[PDB]
Amino acid sequence: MKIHEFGLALFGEHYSANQFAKILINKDGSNVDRKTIQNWINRDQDLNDWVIVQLKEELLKREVILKNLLTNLSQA
Amino acid sequence: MKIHEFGLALFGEHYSANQFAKILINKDGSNVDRKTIQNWINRDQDLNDWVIVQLKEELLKREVILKNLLTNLSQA
């Protein structure tokens, strides 16, 4: 898996490595570095399981928030 | 209506005005300028109807992208 499809869903077409840096956590609790994520983009790397799990939690959290908004704004 | 919930749904906790400048267009088809959106965020302005619709577009397209990626990641 690549980060690209995650970036479209969490941040849109123009997602940055910096945008992932504010939500990505290392196993020991440190922030994941913007330059590490840039390397993922630059080398089009497959992601490790820890990051996929971390990103998959964000997607399920965002789906809840997005669904509440869509409900509150239905039928303009 | 305020942009804050839209920023949460579209870009998360650390959303910026520039992320909006890249998806918002003026009626004539020109881009919306970062400093107008900075004013909306900074002073918590009420949103205009033309803006609300464009953001509603964004929410609805994202659900489709986001719900689909989740079906490709179901049951780890």
Residues of A in contact with B11 (CB under 8 A): 11-12, 19
Main-chain phi, psi angles of B58, to 5 degrees = -60, -45
- Of the candidates B5, B70, B53, B16, the one whose C-alpha atom is nearest the C-alpha of residue A55 is B70
Which residue is it, tokens 């719900």?
Answer: B67
Q: With contact defined as beta carbons under 8 Å apart, do A54 and A27 qualify?
A: no
Closest residue to A9, CB basis, from B56, B58, B66: B66
| H-helix segments, chain B | 4-11, 17-21, 34-43, 49-71
Encoded tokens for B1: 């209506």
What sign for the dihedral angle of Cα B74, A33, A25, A20?
Answer: negative
Helix/strand/coil (H, E, C) string of A17-35? HHHHHCCCECCCCCECCHH
Q: Does the distance separating the beta carbons of B13 and A11 come in below 8 Å? A: no
Q: Please give the interface size between A and B, counted as residue pairs whose CB atoms are below 8 Å apart.
A: 69
Exposed / middle / buried, residue B9 (Cβ in 10 Å: 0-12, 13-18, 19+): buried
Q: Does residue A4 belong to the interface with chain B, where contact is any CB pair within 8 Å?
A: no
> Is A65 within 8 Å of B9 when comparing Cβ atoms?
yes
Close Cβ partners of B75 (under 8 Å, ≥ 6 residues apart): none
- β-partners of residue B25 are B31
Identity (one letter) of the amino acid at B18? N
Q: Distance between CA A36 and CA B9 in Å, rounded?
A: 26
Nearest CA in chain B to A21: B14
CB proximity B25 to A under 8 Å: no
Q: Taking the CA atoms of A61, A66, A71 and A73 in sequence, report the sign of the dihedral they define.
A: positive
Domain ranges of chain A: 4-72
Q: Resolution of this PDB entry, in A? A: 2.8
- The span from the CA of A55 to the CA of B51, in Å, is 29
- Whether B59 contacts B52, CB under 8 Å: no
Helices (H), A1-75: 4-11, 17-21, 34-43, 49-72
Give the contacts of B7 (CB within 8 A, at least 6 positions apart): B15, B19, B20, B41
